[PDB]
Symmetry: C2
């Protein structure tokens, strides 16, 4: 019974006190209405005293204890003040409003928790939101209200004056916007004395009886006045006064007191609704706590390498990073890298390019085979029996061989270019992977990679050109054709193995080794470390936020464990 419902709301109160209100939905009741709706007078009727316009949400926590009427104000600036008097409450509230908003009429999403424990106030926790009305100001108010009412865990409480058509009210309009079904919307009609025509009377009479699709229905209460702040009427006598009013009323007596009550059972209705709602939303709340904790933990696992700790753990950290980087580079060189689905390794791509090279060599081999075939076939029969000196050229075939070799120069260089490109790309990718968060270090590494790439490229091209220079400068009608064909085959093989050897050696092994040695060379300057390991200064703030979030969530789990016990 009572012993079940009190700690029930105490749990959620404790959760919001340490909220944990962010990044997850938390059960609450939001009071929404126009500035002239008089919702403050209703809150005054419930708590005993309220503001005579709020700028920031007021977390009204009411407790019913047969000890004494005591009140404590808790402010988001991590402060707490014991005023022990209802009168001082509104003044200190206004002080807090001045603190949070900025002395003037501003707006803030920061919470003011009002903890009032009294034997004359119903046990109920509800949240008061600022009144409605490019931009100007009211826009951010509607945004603030939307922040709450959009949640399914938030019960809408619309406050509507009796002297206005409820179907044209902005509060109920927004409530319908976020809840078209009306499954979590409660409507209270206030200021029944302020109306001045029978028209409004019967309109209220047909409104109290479900005409609008609100599952929770409607209730009608007396404002008790917002202008009479100092009169200070007792809650019991105020209740009796309201009962007297509705009972004396020609229409409202029989039609309301028999059905939807007018007597301050509103707080009891809100109590029951809050209990049932919380009981409904508890499992998903626990689930979301665990899940959010997991996601925060993972996102935090993605970034954590920050602690320097007297430079030693920092230089050691740098050593670790460079070590891992060099390891991955070595993996790239050896072809022992981890790739994604349908993704191929660098070394394999390079091997494909080598296959292309082999194909080209075969093509040109057959070509020059045909060429020298026709040459030998022709000039061995040319002037076969002419008395001259002879013997129809011999130095000439060498320039044919020269053509055969020369045609291979540019394709090889092109292959070298491609290899250097893709390898460069891979190295840059690794450099980005290991040094993403660190901009300066990444710049240094990439610059180094660029330089070494250029140097080894020059070396490789020089060695290729050297190879071709060596190939050129060094040396029964169709016997010669056979000889030269054999020569072409052997040369084809020799090049087919030689050029990929050069490309692999200079672009993979030597490049990788030089890169690693340069990486080791980097950490030689100690006083440069701080410049190297400079974070974004955005990831740090994010890290702090995630850490605080996780801490708060662990506190939530702890409190939940206490409640379950």
């Amino acid at each position: 019974y009572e012993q079940k419902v009190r700690p029930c709301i105490d749990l959620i109160d404790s959760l919001r006190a340490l909220g944990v209100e962010q990044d997850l939905a938390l059960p609450a009741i939001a009071v929404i209405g126009d500035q002239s709706s008089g919702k403050s007078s209703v809150l005054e009727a419930l708590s005993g005293v309220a503001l005579p316009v709020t700028r920031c949400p007021l977390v009204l926590k009411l407790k019913k204890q047969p000890c004494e009427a005591w009140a404590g104000r808790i402010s988001y600036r991590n402060t707490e003040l014991e005023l022990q008097d209802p009168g001082q409450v509104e003044k200190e509230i206004h002080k807090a409003q001045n603190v949070m908003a900025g002395n003037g009429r501003g707006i803030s999403h920061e919470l003011i928790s009002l903890e009032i424990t009294s034997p004359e106030v119903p046990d109920l926790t509800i949240i008061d939101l600022p009144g409605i009305t490019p931009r100007d100001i009211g826009l951010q108010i509607k945004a603030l209200i939307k922040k709450y009412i959009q949640r399914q865990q938030t019960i809408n409480l619309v406050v509507v004056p009796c002297n206005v058509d409820i179907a044209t009210t902005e509060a109920l309009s927004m409530a319908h916007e976020v809840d078209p079904e009306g499954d979590r919307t409660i409507g209270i009609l206030t200021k029944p004395d302020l109306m001045d025509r029978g028209t409004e009377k019967s309109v209220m009479n047909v409104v109290r009886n479900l005409t609008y699709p609100l599952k929770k229905g409607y209730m009608i209460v007396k404002c008790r006045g917002q202008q009479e702040i100092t009169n200070r009427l007792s809650l019991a006598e105020a209740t009796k006064k309201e009962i007297t009013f509705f009972q004396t009323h020609p229409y409202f007596r029989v039609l309301l007191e028999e059905g939807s009550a007018t007597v301050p059972r509103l707080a009891e209705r809100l109590t029951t609704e809050l209990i049932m709602h919380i009981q409904k939303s508890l499992p998903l709340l626990e689930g979301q706590i665990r899940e959010s904790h997991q996601k925060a933990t993972e996102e935090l696992r993605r970034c954590g390498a920050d602690i320097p700790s007297q430079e030693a753990d920092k230089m050691f950290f740098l050593i670790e990073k460079i070590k891992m980087f060099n390891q991955d580079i070595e993996k790239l060189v050896e072809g022992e890298e981890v790739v994604r689905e349908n993704e191929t390794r660098l070394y394999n791509k390079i091997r494909e390019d080598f296959k292309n090279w082999v194909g080209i060599l075969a093509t040109n081999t057959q070509k020059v085979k045909n060429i020298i075939h026709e040459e030998v076939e022709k000039y061995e029969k040319q002037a076969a029996a002419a008395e001259l000196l002879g013997f129809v050229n011999y130095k000439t075939f060498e320039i044919i061989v020269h053509q055969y070799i020369q045609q291979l120069v540019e394709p090889a260089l092109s292959m070298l270019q491609k290899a250097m490109e893709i390898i460069q790309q891979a190295f840059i990718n690794v450099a980005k992977k290991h040094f993403g968060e660190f901009f300066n270090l990444n710049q240094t590494v990439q610059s180094t990679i660029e330089d070494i790439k250029v140097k080894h490229t020059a070396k490789a091209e020089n060695m290729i050109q050297l190879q071709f220079r060596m190939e050129q400068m060094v040396f029964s009608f169709t016997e010669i054709g056979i000889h030269l064909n054999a020569y072409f085959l052997e040369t084809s093989k020799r090049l087919a193995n030689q050029i990929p050897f050069i490309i692999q050696y200079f672009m993979l092994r030597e490049n990788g080794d030089s890169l690693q040695k340069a990486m080791m060379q980097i950490l030689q300057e100690k006083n440069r470390y701080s410049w190297l390991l400079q974070e974004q200064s955005e990831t740090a703030t994010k890290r702090r936020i995630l850490k605080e979030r996780i801490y708060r969530l662990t506190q939530a789990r702890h409190a939940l464990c206490q409640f379950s016990s």
Copy 2:
């Protein structure tokens, strides 16, 4: 007749006057005899006046002309003095002897020409040689006389005293040594009064007649005395005195005056004999002139020099030399060099070394073939029972291949060493051929060759090591065996072509090109030219000698042409 026979000896007199006595045989009559033979007294009896021991050869030229008594002394010191009086002649002659020999009893090959023209002395040219008998003295004397009597164009004139056994005389002994046939040996017997028995008379008389195989025979004259300088006996009365002496002699009258005369008509007979001798040896003399001229001209042509008159035409010569050198170097590089019989070319030797390399590669190929064959065949079956744990071995075969490749490094380097050595040797040889006479230029060239050799050697070995590094760092029960065997074969071929390509390219082509370009670089410095083209300078002196020789020989040809006309 006479007018024809006089220029016959006048020719040889003119030839020796401009001699051209060196490097060829020249018709002459050499006077040889012992120091105590008294040959000087014989020369005094023949010419009218003589020395009262000669140290240098005396070219006695006697002319019979009905003009006037004239005497002229011609000395090898390029001097000439006309004293026209016998006393001053004999006084100046010993002075000349002192000048040429060195004041003391020395020896010299320098000539003293004595030109005596008188209507009472026979026309005859003869040469007086020093008397016979560390070092001490006689060895070079006998050598000097031998230098003359060895010639077939030289008539021997031996002077032997009557009071001594002619068969034990050294002069006639040497005459027999150089003329065993006795076809050009004449014997004069002197001092017949010094004998003191009839035995020596008859023995000498029967010995001269029919005992020696001398074609020219023997003749006997009176010494006329060497001690009676102040008596001054008339030539006619001396002749009549000699005739009286031989007529009064018991044996000499009938046996000599009837046959081999004793009156100084001997010199006229010697004149005729000289005529016939010169006429006999003239064609071969002309031949020797032609041969010596041709050989001197050719020997001078074998060397081209100097030849800088000035700065122009000198540098151009250097350009030519460097051009030819570079041409020969290019010949070495292309393998288009000229070699001697049974001599091989550098390129061919290098190719042989390459064949050795191929053989080694074949050996190691078969080696690793057998090894991997046994490895795959055995260790794939060497399981405990059924292999259900592996995954046998794969890195092992990789290190086997790696070792197989590594083993080939040192032989290749050795081959490179050998090639660089022999090529260096060849280049140095060419440098020596083109720059033999020029020391400094040769030094510069050889130094350059050394430096370039070292550099390209470093390049070559670096490229070989690079190649092997590329070979290493880059890669039906006996399928693995098949694959690896194919790989070994292809690798074997590839290396077999690659390493000789590197060695040949760097040691022949690049070395040669760098060398030639350096040779072109040499002539950039002008002020170095004179330093570069530095003669032996012994070759300059040799050239001077050859030039003088050629000029003198042309003079000889001129005089001979005058004689022929």
